[PDB]
Amino acid sequence: HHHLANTSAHDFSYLKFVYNATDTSLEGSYDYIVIGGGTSGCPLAATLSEKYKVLLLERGTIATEYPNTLTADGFAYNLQQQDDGKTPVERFVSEDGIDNVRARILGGTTIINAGVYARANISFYSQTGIEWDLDLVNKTYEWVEDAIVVKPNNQSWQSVIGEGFLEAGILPDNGFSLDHEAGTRLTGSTFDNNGTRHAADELLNKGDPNNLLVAVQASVEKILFSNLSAIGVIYTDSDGNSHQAFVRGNGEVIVSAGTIGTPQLLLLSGVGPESYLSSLNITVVQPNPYVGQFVYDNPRNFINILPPNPIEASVVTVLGIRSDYYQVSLSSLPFSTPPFSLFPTTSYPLPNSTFAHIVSQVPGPLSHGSVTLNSSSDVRIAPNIKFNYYSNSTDLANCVSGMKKLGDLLRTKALEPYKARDVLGIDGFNYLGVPLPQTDDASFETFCLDNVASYWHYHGGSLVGKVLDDSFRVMGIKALRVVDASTFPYEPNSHPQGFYLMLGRYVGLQILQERS
Numbered sequence: 313h314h315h316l317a318n319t320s321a322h323d324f325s326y327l328k329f330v331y332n333a334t335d336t337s338l339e340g341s342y343d344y345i346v347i348g349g350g351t352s353g354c355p356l357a358a359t360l361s362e363k364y365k366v367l368l369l370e371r372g373t374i375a376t377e378y379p380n381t382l383t384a385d386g387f388a389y390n391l392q393q394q395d396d397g398k399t400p401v402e403r404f405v406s407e408d409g410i411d412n413v414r415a416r417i418l419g420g421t422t423i424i425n426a427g428v429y430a431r432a433n434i435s436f437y438s439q440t441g442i443e444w445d446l447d448l449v450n451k452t453y454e455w456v457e458d459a460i461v462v463k464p465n466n467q468s469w470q471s472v473i474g475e476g477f478l479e480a481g482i483l484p485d486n487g488f489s490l491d492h493e494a495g496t497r498l499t500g501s502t503f504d505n506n507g508t509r510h511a512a513d514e515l516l517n518k519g520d521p522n523n524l525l526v527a528v529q530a531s532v533e534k535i536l537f538s539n540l541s542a543i544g545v546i547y548t549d550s551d552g553n554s555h556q557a558f559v560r561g562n563g564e565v566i567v568s569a570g571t572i573g574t575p576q577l578l579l580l581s582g583v584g585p586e587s588y589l590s591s592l593n594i595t596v597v598q599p600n601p602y603v604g605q606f607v608y609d610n611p612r613n614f615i616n617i618l619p620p621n622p623i624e625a626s627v628v629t630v631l632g633i634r635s636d637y638y639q640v641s642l643s644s645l646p647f648s649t650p651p652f653s654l655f656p657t658t659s660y661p662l663p664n665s666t667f668a669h670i671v672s673q674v675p676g677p678l679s680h681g682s683v684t685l686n687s688s689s690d691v692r693i694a695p696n697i698k699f700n701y702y703s704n705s706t707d708l709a710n711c712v713s714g715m716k717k718l719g720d721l722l723r724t725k726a727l728e729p730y731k732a733r734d735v736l737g738i739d740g741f742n743y744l745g746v747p748l749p750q751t752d753d754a755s756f757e758t759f760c761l762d763n764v765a766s767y768w769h770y771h772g773g774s775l776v777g778k779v780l781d782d783s784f785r786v787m788g789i790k791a792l793r794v795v796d797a798s799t800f801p802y803e804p805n806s807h808p809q810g811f812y813l814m815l816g817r818y819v820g821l822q823i824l825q826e827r828s
């Protein structure tokens with residue numbers, strides 16, 4: 313409010329200091345090296361560059377190469393596009409069997425995501441026990457929001473869903489608010505009112521162009537070490553040739569390669585569980601039993617309704633929040649090619665008309681799994697990942713509560729106009745896929761287990777309190793930090809990009825304050 317961004321084209325001014333990793337003149341010594349130009353990595357690198365020489369290394373290319381990443385209309389397209397190793401969406405399947413994606417592009421997952429912007433639940437900070445500078449946290453949210461967050465305009469389906477949330481008892485009406493609070497609200501979006509996507513790469517425009525260099529298609533393969541200290545990285549370019557870059561003096565390497573990429577790189581570099589790394593004949597630099605451990609994926613459960621008259625497609629902006637479930641709905645055109653991981657399997661029925669995807673998210677979650685290496689040498693080979701969905705019964709109980717609330721939502725007068733048949737029950741809707749069950753808990757448990765998908769908000773693998781201290785330093789190693797979604801075991805809110813955008817700059821400011 314007051315400070316929020318305006319509608320405007322995507323600002324690629326920063327491309328004036330973006331270079332192909334094939335350029336050997338980038339090799340040398342910097343004050344900071346940031347690995348991964350994503351949600352946390354971009355504002356971290358921009359912030360550090362205000363005073364110091366920074367090299368940001370990103371394995372993907374620049375978003376201008378894939379224009380459908382730059383509009384709200386292109387959201388499904390990037391997920392429908394086949395993964396050829398260069399596309400901004402990298403496809404994967406967890407060992408649980410659930411299809412999923414991660415970003416491979418400068419800007420990270422903010423370039424492919426659903427655009428929902430929220431600040432962290434204000435209780436999160438005290439829950440962590442970290443000594444946060446809370447005033448600075450809030451100044452930093454405003455720094456991000458001034459650049460890339462707007463108040464969304466009205467969308468007919470979002471307004472329907474918001475009336476339904478309220479009628480179904482998800483109270484109070486919070487109006488327009490960026491805050492994760494119980495009740496129903498319109499939140500911010502990183503899509504602007506013209507549908508232009510804004511993203512973490514635009515925060516590079518706040519860096520000092522004399523101090524910040526960005527290398528794209530830079531695949532960082534290994535952290536180099538010396539008092540055990542990180543001293544640099546090895547990265548390879550798109551032609552396959554290798555390159556080295558180093559930090560100097562009191563500088564530091566920061567890993568911002570995401571929930572999947574950060575544990576992978578730590579393990580490949582010999583930071584990780586001693587018996588596991590020894591089992592792979594990877595030389596142990598720093599034993600730590602928790603690298604790649606405590607990896608979480610909040611479950612998404614859903615139904616799809618097919619209204620008898622067309623509904624307008626929308627981006628998610630209206631949120632229904634309770635402590636035990638977070639709910640939204642997306643409306644979408646039909647398609648004959650599925651957006652990968654929207655549904656949990658490729659063998660899911662295709663919609664022939666417009667549909668509403670009505671969704672609940674389990675908080676936490678309490679179930680967790682791990683990231684392990686698939687290759688002990690090649691960072692381009694994706695690691696194995698398993699989330700163990702619903703292995704914790706509290707998660708299953710919370711999904712049951714969310715699914716019952718979705719039942720309530722389907723029974724509201726707000727959603728009544730979208731039934732195919734004017735009958736009393738919710739079997740008057742036409743469904744794509746499996747409808748909601750029956751009244752007893754056992755049928756809701758079965759529905760939750762069988763039809764789970766990824767919410768895409770996975771986190772963990774390099775936790776504060778396990779791998780990192782409260783300053784995000786890797787314990788036992790000087791000049792090495794981790795800043796991204798690998799760092800916390802629970803969500804900060806229903807939609808975490810806002811927290812991790814903030815976190816990139818905030819830790820950058822903490823580093824600079826430490827320096828001084």
Ligand SMILES: Cc1cc2nc3c(=O)[nH]c(=O)nc-3n(C[C@H](O)[C@H](O)[C@H](O)COP(=O)(O)OP(=O)(O)OC[C@H]3O[C@@H](n4cnc5c(N)ncnc54)[C@H](O)[C@@H]3O)c2cc1C
Nearest residue numbers: 348350351371420421425426427428532573797807808809
């Ligand atoms: C489809 C989808 C939709 C989403 N929608 C929303 C939403 O609407 N709202 C919301 O709040 N959250 C959303 N999220 C979640 C949120 O966007 C992510 O949790 C968050 O962006 C993760 O930030 P990160 O910095 O941890 O990772 P990333 O943003 O993915 O950054 C990691 C970067 O590191 C790079 N990298 C990895 N390994 C290496 C390496 N070895 N060398 C060099 N570079 C490397 C990657 O290419 C990537 O750019 C969505 C997620 C997905 C998948």
Ligand SMILES: *[C@@H]1O[C@H](CO)[C@@H](O)[C@H](O)[C@H]1NC(C)=O
Nearest residue numbers: 332334373374528529550551
């Ligand atoms: C980098 O250069 C190689 C040729 O040496 C080219 O194939 C590749 O597309 C370039 N990448 C970018 C991001 O410009």
Ligand SMILES: *[C@@H]1O[C@H](CO)[C@@H](O)[C@H](O)[C@H]1NC(C)=O
Nearest residue numbers: 431434446447449450490491
């Ligand atoms: C930070 O902002 C939130 C709103 O997002 C507000 O509730 C809180 O009081 C603020 N905290 C401080 C320390 O200013």
Ligand SMILES: *[C@@H]1O[C@H](CO)[C@@H](O)[C@H](O)[C@H]1NC(C)=O
Nearest residue numbers: 588589590591592593594688
């Ligand atoms: C590790 O190396 C030893 C030889 O030093 C060999 O016996 C063992 O099979 C190797 N294990 C792996 C997983 O490569």
Ligand SMILES: *[C@@H]1O[C@H](CO)[C@@H](O)[C@H](O)[C@H]1NC(C)=O
Nearest residue numbers: 433435436439493494634635
């Ligand atoms: C906010 O976080 C606190 C502390 O973890 C939790 O008790 C509360 O339920 C959360 N509120 C919402 C609306 O998620």
Ligand SMILES: *[C@@H]1O[C@H](CO)[C@@H](O)[C@H](O)[C@H]1NC(C)=O
Nearest residue numbers: 684685686687688694695696
């Ligand atoms: C690597 O991933 C493949 C999937 O293509 C899987 O079949 C294989 O078991 C994995 N190997 C290791 C060592 O993780």
Ligand SMILES: *[C@@H]1O[C@H](CO)[C@@H](O)[C@H](O)[C@H]1NC(C)=O
Nearest residue numbers: 677678679703704705706707
């Ligand atoms: C679930 O998680 C909680 C907290 O982490 C833990 O106490 C419990 O043992 C786990 N398992 C089940 C089945 O609740």
Ligand SMILES: N#C[C@H](O)c1ccccc1
Nearest residue numbers: 426428628640642671767
């Ligand atoms: N992330 C996120 C949004 O909530 C979302 C967007 C599309 C489908 C499900 C959920």
